[PDB]
Design a protein around this ligand. Structure first.
Ligand code: HEM
Ligand code: HEM
Ligand SMILES: Cc1cc(N)nc(CCc2cc(C#N)cc(CCc3cc(C)cc(N)n3)c2)c1
Ligand SMILES: Cc1cc(N)nc(CCc2cc(C#N)cc(CCc3cc(C)cc(N)n3)c2)c1
Ligand SMILES: C[C@H](O)[C@H](O)[C@H]1CNc2nc(N)[nH]c(=O)c2N1
Ligand SMILES: C[C@H](O)[C@H](O)[C@H]1CNc2nc(N)[nH]c(=O)c2N1
Ligand SMILES: [Zn+2]
Lengths: 405, 405
């Protein structure tokens, strides 16, 4: 039942007992493992009531008050509310606890050592796209903090039986436009072609740069989404230069400070928050490796290799591997110079190892998706490569949800 | 959609469905409730007949004679043989097919584009440990072929009803000694401390270098294992140097040419071949990244970085990343110089994508273990990182088996 989990570098073993608490099926079966798939194929009062209770039980236990008067009364409130209305509402403190727990539970997140330090903005009294914009701006300002980045989440109104969802259409709060050219290519970020086109269509005046910050498309229930331009002074950006390579700065490369996911659903106690954007700070491989070097992203390896005068003719010269290292170094150097928070993949994975150990003591296990935890360069050079990991779904949870269009 | 796993490549945006996984008869370690794909080792006449019938059906399909008199007579011959004796025997071309099929089925091997090109040495007549030695030496000579390496496998007699197994105690045909020092460190390869100490226990006179080739501990049915030293002239080795860093040759690093796994079980139609070593050629990251840079192996990252004058006191200089690239380049360069076959991780993973496409057409899928297929440096720089993979067990197969001691 309970899996033995081994670290191969140190030869140590733990047993994951926490997985017995999963109530939600992942994609694998005994016949075949599907653990490497990015998305699940997937994309009543009795059932809401029991997730509700389980979460309230979670919360009172967290404040050591299991079984107290306050606990029993709270379970009664929840039961009374569901029975009469088919739904219920969380108290602010309960929400706060749920958001941290959803982060704690996120198997794909290597930054979870930070999970206890999360500023939570209650935006549940939001009634318009306009109000959503104000809240999003205050989040960005708080989170950014002149480069001294602070983790945060802002929670818009939950989904309801009657009506359309509150949604942020953009996948992140800051995204660069991707412009489909005649010549079939893309100018800017190819990942954001579809969102750039939705923006233009809803009336945005596009640019023609490689790094034009997109406007937000915000949707109040059952209304057309609305367009809002982020004030340039709120979007902190970092020009990329290299400590020793003078020509690198010439490339004109840059990236934003704030990684803020905005298309994911936050589930707490059976309740669903379809708009609940959250941010921390970047690990440098996200920018240096994936965003700049993925062949379907900015795909800049070749340009850099040529600048370094490397032998591009053959894979055996490891030109790809050499240019990648310098691009990652440029990202770290630049963020450090500009006094904006960043973590390298060695420091991050070492702290994830400490987190694994903390969670083993605290909860008897830690859900983790090895393919997402291990960095996209220098995998086996980090300690997580050598760590077996068990993957499963615990609730509170961040989930993927359909695109609104 | 089809009710088979949908599989996506996130670089090209292309989709396939794995229908091959339907043929899987053995459960792996995952369940709906938790994924265990990252674990290295996760965990009767009627049963034999049924595996035998299935393998014979595979054989006759492969020669396009499924349904024929020859097919049903072979079936008849197999069940008669199990009826009277409890076991059965494969024809020669049946063994050749099954050996190739087991390589083809190996989810952890990125080298599978070559699967059709395997020299199968039949050693099912072997009857002593001395003869095992002769066969093994012939394998190495043929496979090594003065540096122009050729894939091969040698098959020794299968497990018999209450008769002892043929076993090769060593994990590979070529391994360096690991000597546990009286200060607690290890000289040589720490992976091989146990087998080194079994070797000495059985009367081997040990050396004291970092790169002493171990002797072979060969076990014939019901006999204690016997010890055989490989004649040095049969063990091709490559001294490591760097194309531009002149001091790298002074490190006195080296590696052997021939990777030959010798502790795996080859299972075909229920029959179990406990000694059946097989060899290919190396992918460079196995040597330059894992074998040399793993903390629990040669661990040379720090030494190399010091020679390169890197800042080894801060993670954010990427000192580990820069040293690893250079050690990897040195492995490729030294092998090329010495005319000994090797393949870099770019060329290997590209060829594996081609293999994925061939197998989609030929069998409707390909079992693949993402954590093992993705190379341990430059992960997302290779096309396999962006390819979803389905993992399941098909037979014939190579399986792990308990250590003989
Ligand atoms: C504090 C600094 C943080 C760091 C360095 C960090 C690090 C990372 C990294 C490297 C990834 C993989 C991302 C990718 O490949 O695109 C990730 C994923 C993720 N993180 Fe974090 N994280 C941080 C904070 C947070 C916070 C505050 C939350 C939510 C409260 C969070 C929840 C998640 C989730 C749900 C994923 C999976 C995203 C997806 O499926 O697309 N993380 N994290
Ligand atoms: C032709 C050149 C070949 C290349 C480049 C190659 C490449 C590799 C690599 C890089 C691995 C992972 C090794 C590790 O991380 O320790 C591997 C594993 C494996 N390969 Fe190959 N391979 C080749 C030929 C073969 C052959 C000839 C066979 C058997 C007939 C084979 C069967 C296997 C098996 C069973 C594994 C998994 C072994 C384990 O779990 O330890 N491969 N291969
Ligand atoms: C808080 C935080 C901090 C930090 N340092 N990094 C992150 C991860 C960022 C991330 C952004 C996007 C986007 N857009 C997609 C991903 C995953 C890729 C993806 C791709 C697709 C197609 C859908 C989907 N839901 N996700 C990750 C978050
Ligand atoms: C034919 C061929 C070609 C090629 N390029 N590479 C290989 C496989 C390499 C490999 C070797 C060993 C060993 N010894 C162990 C492994 C597995 C790692 C391992 C390590 C330990 C300690 C235990 C265990 N069960 N498994 C892999 C084969
Ligand atoms: C197909 C494969 O699962 C996919 O490329 C994953 C691999 N690992 C990852 N890991 C992280 N952190 N982020 C990613 O986007 C991915 N992509
Ligand atoms: C814990 C993890 O499964 C383990 O370190 C795996 C990861 N991927 C690997 N991939 C290959 N090719 N070889 C290995 O030994 C490993 N080790
Ligand atoms: Zn799985």
């Amino acid at each position: 039942k309970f899996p033995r989990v081994k670290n191969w570098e140190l030869g140590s073993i733990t047993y994951d007992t926490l997985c017995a608490q999963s109530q939600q099926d992942g994609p694998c079966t005994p016949r075949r493992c599907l653990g490497s798939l990015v998305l699940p194929r997937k994309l009543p009062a009795e059932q809401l009531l029991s997730q509700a209770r389980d979460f309230i039980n979670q919360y009172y236990s967290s404040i050591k008050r299991s079984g107290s008067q306050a606990h029993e009364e709270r379970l009664q409130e929840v039961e009374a509310e569901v029975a009469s209305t088919g739904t219920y509402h969380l108290r602010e403190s309960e929400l706060v606890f749920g958001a941290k727990q959803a982060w704690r539970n996120a198997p794909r997140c290597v930054g979870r050592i930070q999970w206890g330090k999360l500023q939570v903005f209650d935006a549940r009294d939001c009634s318009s796209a306009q109000e959503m914009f104000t809240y999003i701006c205050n989040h960005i300002k708080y989170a950014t903090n002149r480069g001294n980045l602070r983790s945060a989440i802002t929670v818009f109104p939950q989904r309801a039986p009657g009506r359309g969802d509150f949604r942020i259409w953009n996948s992140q709060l800051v995204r660069y436009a991707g412009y489909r050219q005649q010549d079939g290519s893309v100018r800017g970020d190819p990942a954001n072609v579809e969102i750039t086109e939705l923006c233009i269509q809803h009336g945005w005046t596009p640019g023609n740069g490689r790094f034009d910050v997109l406007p937000l498309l915000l949707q109040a229930p059952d209304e057309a989404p609305e367009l809002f331009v982020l004030p340039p002074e709120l979007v902190l950006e970092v020009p990329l230069e290299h400590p020793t390579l003078e020509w690198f700065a010439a490339l004109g490369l840059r990236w934003y400070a704030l990684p803020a996911v905005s298309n994911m659903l936050l589930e707490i106690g059976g309740l669903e928050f379809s708009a609940a954007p959250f941010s921390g700070w970047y690990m440098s491989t996200e920018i240096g490796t994936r965003n700049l070097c993925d062949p379907h992203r900015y795909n800049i390896l070749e340009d850099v290799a040529v600048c370094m005068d490397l032998d591009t003719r053959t894979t055996s010269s490891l030109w790809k591997d050499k240019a990648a290292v310098e691009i990652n170094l440029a990202v770290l150097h630049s963020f450090q110079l500009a006094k904006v928070t960043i973590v390298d993949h060695h420091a991050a994975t070492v702290s994830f190892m400490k987190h694994l150990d903390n969670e083993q003591k605290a909860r008897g296990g830690c859900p983790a998706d090895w393919a997402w935890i291990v960095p996209p360069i220098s995998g086996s050079l980090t300690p997580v490569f050598h760590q077996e990991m068990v993957n499963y779904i615990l609730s509170p949870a961040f989930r993927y949800q359909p695109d609104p269009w």
